[PDB]
């Protein structure tokens, strides 16, 4: 025996700021949905923001480009707030190029079909010597909330590009949210209420798009709330590894020559549980292996304690 709300006039007043209104609200649901939406609007909203950046002739955040009046540590801290919007893509690497005594704005980038520089005046840095010239590979991803620079090295496994300066990721386009429910009487109804949710964007979410994907989460969360199946997990994982784990590491770890490194890509051999079981027979007939080419592989398997070509009637188990 209940009602349900909907969204009447959404009233922009700036690209950044707008009061969206929700008319059919019952007594008190105003503050109920109002607070519980601010909570999910200020946090969980999707957002894209620059993640890594490589710049022409600079090695770390703490140096000085010739003929620019910012320091790399400042230019990065300028990019953190560069407000972009992209569509079909998930990570896009923009390119920046400009010379000559002149403020390099956001407009000075190059456009991709999905890139919309929602503020092209945004200062990135200033050049200052006639023929001083910068170029950079700015890389933008898109995630949820606040992924600070530091936590973005534990996946390492060759992020070596010394040039790539990582910037703290502020993946969100909410700046500040504020609801106020003023009472609103539809002509006949005892007392219903309004809900003006005044909000402050960075420019790259159109209010309605947001407030919808906000309510969506609340559902999936409340989805498990409806019934309560006492649910738990299977657990008790497996305690029986057969082979030595060494046969589960990729062939990179073998630290071998380049002509021999791509050659195990070719003949289909990633884990060393396959290099372990391929005899010398198998090896002259493989693309580009010879007298000098295969002596290399019998020597890095010796140091770690394995041999070439044997068996294991059970490879690889089992999930």
């Amino acid at each position: 025996e209940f009602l349900k709300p909907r969204l009447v006039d959404i009233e922009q007043v700036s690209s950044t700021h707008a009061k969206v209104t929700l008319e059919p609200l019952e007594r008190g649901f105003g503050h109920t949905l109002g607070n519980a939406l601010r909570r999910i609007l200020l946090s969980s909203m999707p957002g894209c923001a620059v993640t890594e950046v490589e710049i022409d002739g600079v090695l770390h955040e703490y140096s000085t480009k010739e003929g620019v009046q910012e320091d790399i540590l400042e230019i990065l801290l300028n990019l953190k707030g560069l407000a972009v919007r992209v569509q079909g893509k998930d990570e896009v690497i923009l390119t920046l190029n400009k010379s000559g005594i002149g403020p390099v704005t956001a407009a000075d980038i190059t456009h991709d079909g999905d890139v919309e520089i929602v503020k092209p005046q945004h200062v990135i840095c200033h050049l200052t010597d006639e023929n001083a010239s910068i170029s950079m590979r700015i890389k933008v991803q898109r995630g949820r909330g606040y992924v600070p620079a530091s936590t973005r090295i534990h996946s390492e496994e060759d992020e070596r590009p010394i040039g790539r300066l990582l910037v703290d990721a502020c993946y969100s386009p909410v700046e500040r949210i504020a609801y106020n429910v003023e009472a609103a009487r539809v002509e006949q109804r005892t007392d219903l209420d309004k809900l003006v949710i005044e909000m402050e964007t960075n420019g790259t979410i159109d209010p309605e798009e947001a407030i919808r994907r906000a309510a969506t989460i609340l559902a999936e969360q409340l989805e498990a709330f409806v019934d309560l199946r006492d649910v738990r997990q299977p657990e008790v994982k497996e305690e029986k590894p057969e082979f030595d784990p060494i046969l589960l590491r990729p062939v990179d770890d073998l630290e071998l020559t380049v002509r021999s490194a791509n050659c195990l890509k070719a003949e289909a051999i990633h884990y060393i549980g396959d290099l372990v079981q391929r005899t010398e027979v198998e090896l002259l007939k493989t693309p580009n292996l010879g007298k000098k080419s295969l002596t290399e592989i019998k020597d890095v398997l010796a140091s770690r304690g394995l041999s070439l070509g044997m068996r294991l009637e059970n490879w690889p188990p089992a999930s």
Binding site: T64, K65, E66, E70, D71, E74, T128
Partner: protein, 100 residues
């Protein structure tokens, strides 16, 4: 910068070496995150050797207490500065005021 101040912050910033204070008044020829060149006014400029005052800035470097002491330019290209003007902020100084 302190929203609530006392007035001393400019005296402490300048008189402490951490900031880069203009030797002679003039106009800026070149501004780099590295250095600042001041084309001296005629009045203050000595007769011979003529030339310009060139202030080389201190960039990211270790302090006694392992904090970082880094100077930044607080003027822009071709701006008028007079003798005894603030030319570059130290660490924990803003625009000539002491911002701890």
């Amino acid at each position: 910068k302190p929203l609530v101040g006392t007035g001393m912050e400019r005296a402490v910033a300048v008189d402490s070496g951490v900031t880069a204070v203009a030797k002679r008044g003039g106009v800026v020829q070149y501004v780099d995150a590295s250095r600042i060149v001041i084309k001296v006014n005629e009045d203050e400029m000595y007769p011979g050797e003529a030339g310009i005052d060139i202030y080389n800035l201190t960039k990211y470097t270790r302090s006694n207490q392992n904090t970082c002491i880094n100077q930044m330019p607080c003027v822009s290209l071709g701006e008028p500065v007079e003798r005894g003007d603030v030319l570059a902020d130290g660490p924990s100084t803003d625009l000539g005021e002491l911002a701890l």
